[PDB]
Design a protein around this ligand. Structure first.
Ligand SMILES: Nc1ccc2c(NCc3cccs3)nc(-c3ccccc3)nc2c1
Length: 329
């Protein structure tokens, strides 16, 4: 039960344990860079904004704490600490999250050898996340933290639609994990060209650019679309042939072109998985089957539950008290 110290930083007040020093605002819940006197590391402290404001907020706060507490992988952001100034459930209102301070994002950043290492680390993190039955859904360069060492970590908290799989913008329920692989393809394409692959102005224009590259679907994909309106609209467009990816990505590593062909597929049933992609020949120099682990089981059953604010709040308090700090190395 450490001593807490308070200071007003920009808008809001901050009450943190003494071990975290030299708070410096970084963004805006609010996030401060600080120095961790227990480990000697630079860390990011995030103070959640109104974490229990509504049923939706309280469950969202609970969801975020559960996910971060579960992630233990080199290419996924991990939780160093979670704390509150409160001494009891009764006075519990503020939640603070502490993670490693990550240098920059992929947006702030390329050789073919850099793209291999960077995309290999994303796919390595996605295999872990997907093995827990978790879908990211929001992969984009600003959700990828990169070191000065080119070490990459997937994060979660430049248009989001540019990286979204086409099934999500068509509002298909029952999409699978490969919506993330579509995002990887869009990211890898941008690192190889310097240009956004699908800079759509909106959701309609986004699909137009996507289909111009991958083509309008064939009858094998059409016979699996349940929506009659979506099926008619797609069938009424002028048929566009699939462009040759070697032509579009001219001068790139033919192994990189072959992988993009397997990631940017309309039919998500045919799209390549993270595990399958890790064994693609394009990653021969980094791929190690004995060092690409999967995650412990993750209980998502709370997602289907409707509870009161105080109950999500109490479940969140439980997760704060039961937190075991990660081992120091
Ligand atoms: N097994 C599969 C594989 C892909 C699918 C897909 N892909 C998005 C597009 C398909 C054709 C043009 S965009 N879209 C849908 C879908 C279903 C209902 C409403 C709207 C879209 N289903 C798919 C089922």
């Amino acid at each position: 039960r450490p001593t807490f110290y308070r200071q007003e930083l920009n808008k809001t007040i901050w009450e943190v344990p003494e071990r975290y020093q030299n708070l410096s605002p970084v963004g805006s819940g609010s996030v401060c860079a600080a120095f961790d006197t227990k480990t000697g590391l630079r860390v990011a402290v995030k103070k959640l904004s109104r974490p229990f404001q509504s049923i939706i907020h309280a469950k969202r706060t609970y969801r975020e704490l559960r996910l971060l507490k579960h992630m233990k992988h080199e290419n996924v952001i991990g939780l160093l600490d979670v704390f509150t100034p409160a001494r009891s459930l009764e006075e519990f209102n503020d939640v603070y999250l502490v993670t490693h301070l990550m240098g920059a994002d992929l947006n702030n950043i390329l050789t073919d050898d850099h793209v291999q290492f960077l995309i290999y680390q994303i796919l390595r993190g996605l295999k872990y996340i997907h093995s827990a039955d978790i879908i990211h859904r929001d992969l984009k360069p600003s959700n990828l933290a990169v070191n000065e060492d080119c070490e990459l970590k997937i994060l979660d908290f430049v248009a989001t639609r540019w990286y979204r799989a086409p099934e999500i913008m068509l509002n298909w329920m029952h999409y699978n994990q490969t919506v993330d692989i579509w995002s990887v393809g869009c990211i890898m394409a941008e690192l190889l060209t310097g240009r956004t692959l699908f800079p759509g102005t909106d959701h309609i224009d986004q699909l137009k650019l996507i289909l111009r590259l991958v083509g309008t679907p064939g009858a094998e994909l059409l016979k699996k679309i349940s929506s009659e309106s979506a099926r008619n609209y797609i069938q009424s467009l002028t048929q566009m042939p699939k462009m040759n990816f070697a032509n579009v990505f001219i001068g790139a590593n033919p192994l990189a072109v072959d992988l993009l062909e397997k990631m940017l597929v309309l039919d998500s049933d045919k799209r390549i998985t993270a595990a399958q992609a890790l064994a693609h020949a394009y990653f021969a120099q980094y791929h190690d089957p004995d060092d690409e682990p999967v995650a412990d089981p993750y209980d998502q059953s709370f997602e289907s539950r409707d509870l009161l604010i105080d109950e999500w709040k109490s479940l969140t308090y439980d997760e704060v008290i039961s937190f075991v700090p990660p081992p120091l190395d």
